[PDB]
Design a protein around this ligand. Structure first.
Ligand SMILES: [Zn+2]
Lengths: 192, 7
């Protein structure tokens, strides 16, 4: 689908916050999500997945208050809790506006694409990151995309970050193709 | 299921 179609899809699943926030930056986050293949976005929409953009801390939302003080998986030793984490992906998606870029409380290439990749993995693709096919790819290429002690340890995180590289822009797409050829082909074939 | 971003 075109960018126009994907933004149309995203206008039906993206939820904007009540309080004040940077409207232009929220729009920029939507624009980057619009690079995701429309097949995935419409599957998320069919499953009533909402992409919640947040004006404050994740745990300030009523539905995430249960995570206050909880140490996220893989963040052991960081001294941080979910209160300080700018994004969440999986059965739901919640993203703090303004924290997209690497270094804004995270080291993902892009916050919203990484988090939405987790939701696509889990909701649309039946946890494909844990499939035998992807485990063999992850075993070979899981350390070729940096942050090897994190991406190289958790297949779901390698899937999510590889997904983000594939769709952020053409430079990251090409960088993935050179560093992780089997992962690139896997994602290319997955999208038809 | 919840997953945090890369630290
Ligand atoms: Zn993650």
């Amino acid at each position: 689908t075109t960018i126009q179609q994907n933004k149309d899809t995203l206008s039906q699943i993206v939820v904007f916050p009540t309080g004040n926030y940077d409207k232009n930056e929220a729009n920029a986050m939507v624009n980057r999500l619009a690079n995701i293949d429309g097949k995935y976005l419409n599957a998320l929409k069919q499953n009533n997945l909402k992409i919640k953009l947040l004006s404050g801390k994740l745990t300030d939302e009523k539905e995430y208050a249960y995570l206050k003080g909880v140490v996220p998986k893989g963040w052991e030793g960081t001294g941080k809790t979910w209160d300080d984490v700018p994004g969440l992906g999986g059965s739901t998606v919640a993203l703090r506006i303004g924290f997209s870029n690497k270094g804004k409380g995270h080291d993902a290439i892009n916050l919203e694409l990484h988090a939405t990749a987790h939701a696509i993995d889990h909701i649309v693709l039946n946890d494909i990151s844990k499939s035998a096919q992807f485990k063999q790819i992850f075993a070979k290429e899981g350390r070729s995309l940096g942050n090897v002690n994190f991406l190289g340890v958790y297949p779901a995180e390698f899937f999510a970050e590889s997904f983000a590289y594939y769709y952020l822009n053409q430079d990251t797409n090409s960088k993935l193709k050179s560093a992780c050829p089997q992962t690139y082909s896997f994602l290319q074939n997955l999208a038809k | 299921e919840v997953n945090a971003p890369v630290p």
